[model samples]
Target: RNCIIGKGRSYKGTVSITKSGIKCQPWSSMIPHEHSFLPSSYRGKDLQENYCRNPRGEEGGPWCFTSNPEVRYEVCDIPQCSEVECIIGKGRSYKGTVSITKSGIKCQPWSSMIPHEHSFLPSSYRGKDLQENYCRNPRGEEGGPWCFTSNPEVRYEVCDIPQCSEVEHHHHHH
Candidate 1:
């Protein structure tokens, strides 16, 4: 299980800085505390030199972290999170994936396919409209089949976050 922070943040698992990009030990926090300190699945082997994954999937080969403070454990390039949720809107008006990019937290439509959270209603709607009506076309959604006037502003978050069966490569400040 993961811990939550204020806003859209999480303390999901352990991340280590490897010789290359950041590496994630997905669901690492659930394991023994002692186990988290080392990536020692291999017997008497340099953890860093060992493969990051079981050879079964032939995933991106070996990945490990050096035992130097200056080595800088990265926090990104992690395994994509499964089912990232929207900020607010809840199951009531929200049920989608999460993404990183956005114009701002300002009111808007379901902007992208990537998952994202939204706590506020769209600026265009009356405060009473909320999510269910945030994007409801005043003229009707089928106004003209994808017409701008009929476009529903996204009142909630978008989904499509990575699933457990998927893999993605990334790199950044850990």
Candidate 2:
């Protein structure tokens, strides 16, 4: 459940467990190991105790020093915030990299109009990350995010993105 988006630089979650299931060392202490990553040094970061943090904005997401002297540090077991389910209506904001069709067929790259040549091009939808072969619903179709199949037989197919339950937030001010 402890997922992170982008590089997780702002991840303030309390996930201390390392990728290898090792406990993290306290940022306040420097007994087994001593380094520049101190609470005082990394001000404003949730470096309290042994919680995972990315104060340096590392590309490897959130991580922390290990309590075990042998292991200096390890990357936390945090999953990238993937768009597994359609959040918004009709999956309009589905910018995920799921390039597989529901029938297990690879999606054709939007740049390559070889097998399937249609209007869905990166030029058409600038800044939509449509250049890649990832499934996307740039036009906001009712069928959700779908991509052209690599197979010549099938022009395009809908992705396996499930629709999440809509939680209507009602803010009533009397």
Candidate 3:
């Protein structure tokens, strides 16, 4: 019987366990849109070598296998744990440096105390760079430094965070 062990979204792919490692051929043809989110490195590889290794048959231990044959011939002698998956969200703030935060982990950026300008904006435009003019106002009327909207609700706010700081600071300052 097939089994799935994660939440959020469902991903369908062929998983194989071989002497080398676990290889996954995600069903891209059936799900074209999903391909865009995947990393380019994972697309062309014949077999993803050593995805995770199962040295001992103990729970929460490393495991490796191939999905080419469908069923695993290399069964473990002892109890084993399923593979663990993790996701991280990363963005470049006003400082122009990359920052990563793990899922379910709360992190307060150095500028968290400062109110974010786009916090009330629609999700479509939130966290986007204003310099890019994502809405593409040809005359630059909607959201430019020189122009301001009559309706206060549509106004955009500027980010005051510094580009970079020399002093070392904790990621979770109030």
Candidate 4:
């Protein structure tokens, strides 16, 4: 599938185009540019030819080293696989961009404390990317990524993160 599941670390598709329409640089070559994410080293990641892959499990989805000399690398425009949208386990490692609450309320900015006086700061939750109003499980909550709602009345709520197993029946069908 052109789409990727989660961070696309396991993406093995043959999409060779960068997000900006630039062709991908071959993982086996080093003429115009060279990268540490090599085929020989990242064998487990399927670094084949010029295929777009996310060996580092970046939140930006599948990306590739660009053939353009000026551009070293770029994120591909691959869509997330809808079949298994949310993660299977407690989405503690979920780095998605779902920023809406379960009640369809816009998530309050993790950096802002206007309506909600909280201590879920980006520095407190380092590497969690809590900058935007995106939903995230900074403290490994029982549920998945949740955020303080923009609505003052609703202090905090869990986001509508889907379970991967919810689509298991389809996997057995046909």
What does the lDDT come to for candidate 1? Answer: 0.31
Cα TM-score per model: 0.21, 0.48, 0.16, 0.49
lDDT of 2 by residue, 117-157 (tens): 98876887896779589988887888788899999999999
lDDT of 2: 0.80
Please report the TM-score between candidate 4 and the true structure: 0.49
How accurate locally is residue 47 in candidate 4, as Cα lDDT from 0 to 100? Answer: 87
How well does candidate 2 score on lDDT at residue 25? 87
What TM-score should be assigned to candidate 3?
0.16
Please write out the lDDT profile of model 1 over residues 47-106, one tens digit for every residue. Answer: 332223321222333333334334433233334335443322112233232222232333
Regions of candidate 1 where Cα sits further than 4 Å from its true position: 1-10, 13-19, 22-72, 78-91, 95-133, 136-174
Pairs with backbone N, CA or C atoms under 3 Å apart (clashes), candidate 4: none
- The 10 consecutive residues of candidate 2 with the worst lDDT sum are 165-174
How many steric clashes between backbone atoms does each model show? Answer: 17, 0, 15, 0
Task: Please provide, for model 3 over 1-174, each residue's C-alpha lDDT reduced to its tens digit, 9 standing for 90 to 100.
Answer: 012233201212222333344353332321212232233434443222323322223443333332444533232121222422211111132313222221211222322222223332334444443332221111233222211122334343222222223222212221
Candidates 2 and 3 compared: the better one by TM-score is 2
Q: Write the per-residue lDDT of candidate 4 for residues 1-174, one digit (tens) a residue.
A: 566778888887778898899999988988588767768887788988788888888788888888899998899887676644575577888888888988999999999996898999888888888968988888787887899998999999999888766654332121
Which candidate wins on lDDT? 4
**Which candidate ranks first by TM-score, i.e. highest?**
4
